[PDB]
Ligand binder design. Structure first.
Ligand SMILES: COCCOc1cc(-c2scnc2C)ccc1[C@H](C)NC(=O)[C@@H]1C[C@@H](O)CN1C(=O)[C@@H](c1cc(C)no1)C(C)C
Lengths: 89, 148, 104
């Protein structure tokens, strides 16, 4: 079971499964030996939510079951939009 | 190209909203013009009378966000075997995080104030490009053209 | 049933999933593979409560209703440092900025 580390601008280290991080085409280009990525522009309150999106996407993609809404707090929406645009996810 | 075929053969369907959105069912008329039908509140179902070979798509009634029906874009009523109605299961797609973010921002900011946001110019255009049934029908016909 | 978690210690957050029927000890084996610390040098928590290795995640309150992919449940982690275990400390995420006037 392989994992990668995504580090936020404020130093928070997020360890997610490799398969999940490969959701972001941006991350896939740099990885798919190397398993550590620094995001000097993405704070932890945003990067933590990106990691939640990866789990959500892997879980619910091609699912027959009812898919729940992905929640986004108004306060993080603008920063999350910018991160998602860079990450291509 | 994308239009209902005038079969005149009745087909009963269950529109089942398995999404948290208010659903706007849209029927593509004989000329390919989208025709809106009565909305469905979240988690509700309606037994409806349609026809074989007719085309339907489903949207969020308030924002026009794209929804899936039986895990795909379009639903075509078929032949009722043993009088069983056809199930049209409407669900949320797994939106990209970018599109989901655009949906949340558009819901909080009036279109007049998009240009007042502290974001790059490209994201202003992405925000202004509201989900549109006609634009999606153009995209869908273009995609069916790539298939020789 | 699957449960979705965030195992947190200081400024480290592990995103992982497990079964409701899986144990607290099995979750320590996951942390061992990532942070290279054996289960006997780890303590796991649910809020300020120490969790027993033999207890299932469901018994510890980690359920499919509360540990969702889009909103995972938090499990606290404290390592052993020389003779004693350190205090459970989880660094909070950054504070979002004030909502702009056009969003209020
Ligand atoms: C008189 O109108 C009452 C409302 O009609 C309806 C409401 C609802 C819905 S969709 C969500 N909630 C509700 C209740 C669904 C269906 C209907 C009505 C029966 N059913 C329809 O309107 C069906 C749906 C679609 O197949 C076109 N159609 C037709 O009847 C069309 C037609 C007739 C023949 C012959 N071939 O095509 C005409 C509009 C031109």
């Amino acid at each position: 079971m392989m994992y990668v580390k995504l580090i936020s601008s404020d130093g928070h280290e997020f360890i997610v499964k490799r398969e999940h991080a490969l959701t972001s085409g941006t991350i896939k280009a740099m990885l798919s030996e190397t398993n550590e990525v620094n995001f000097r522009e993405i704070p932890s309150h945003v990067l933590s939510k990106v990691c939640m999106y990866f789990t959500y996407k892997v879980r619910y993609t091609n699912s027959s079951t009812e898919i729940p809404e992905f929640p986004i707090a108004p306060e993080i929406a603008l920063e999350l939009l910018m991160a998602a645009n860079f990450l291509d996810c | 190209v994308l239009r209902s075929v005038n079969s005149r053969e009745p087909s009963q369907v269950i529109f089942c909203n398995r999404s948290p959105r208010v659903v706007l069912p849209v029927w593509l008329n004989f000329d390919g013009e989208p025709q809106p039908y009565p909305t469905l509140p979240p988690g509700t179902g309606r037994r409806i009378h349609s026809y074989r070979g007719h085309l339907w798509l489903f949207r969020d009634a308030g924002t026009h966000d794209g929804l899936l029906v039986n895990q795909t874009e379009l639903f075509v009523p078929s032949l009722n075997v043993d009088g069983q109605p056809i199930f049209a299961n409407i669900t949320l797609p797994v939106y990209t995080l970018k599109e989901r973010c655009l949906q949340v921002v558009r819901s909080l900011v009036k279109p007049e104030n998009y240009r007042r946001l502290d974001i790059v110019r490209s994201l202003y255009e992405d925000l202004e490009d509201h989900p549109n049934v006609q634009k999606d029908l153009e995209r869908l016909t273009q995609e069916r053209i790539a298939h020789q | 049933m699957d449960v979705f978690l965030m195992i947190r210690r200081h400024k480290t957050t592990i995103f992982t999933d497990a079964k409701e029927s899986s144990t607290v000890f099995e979750l320590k084996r996951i942390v061992e593979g990532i942070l290279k610390r054996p289960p006997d040098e780890q303590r796991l928590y649910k809020d300020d409560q120490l969790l027993d290795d033999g207890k299932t995640l469901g018994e510890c309150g980690f359920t499919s209703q509360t540990a969702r992919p889009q909103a995972p449940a938090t499990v606290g982690l404290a390592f052993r440092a020389d003779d004693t275990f350190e205090a459970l400390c989880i660094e909070p995420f950054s504070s979002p900025p004030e909502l702009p006037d056009v969003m209020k």
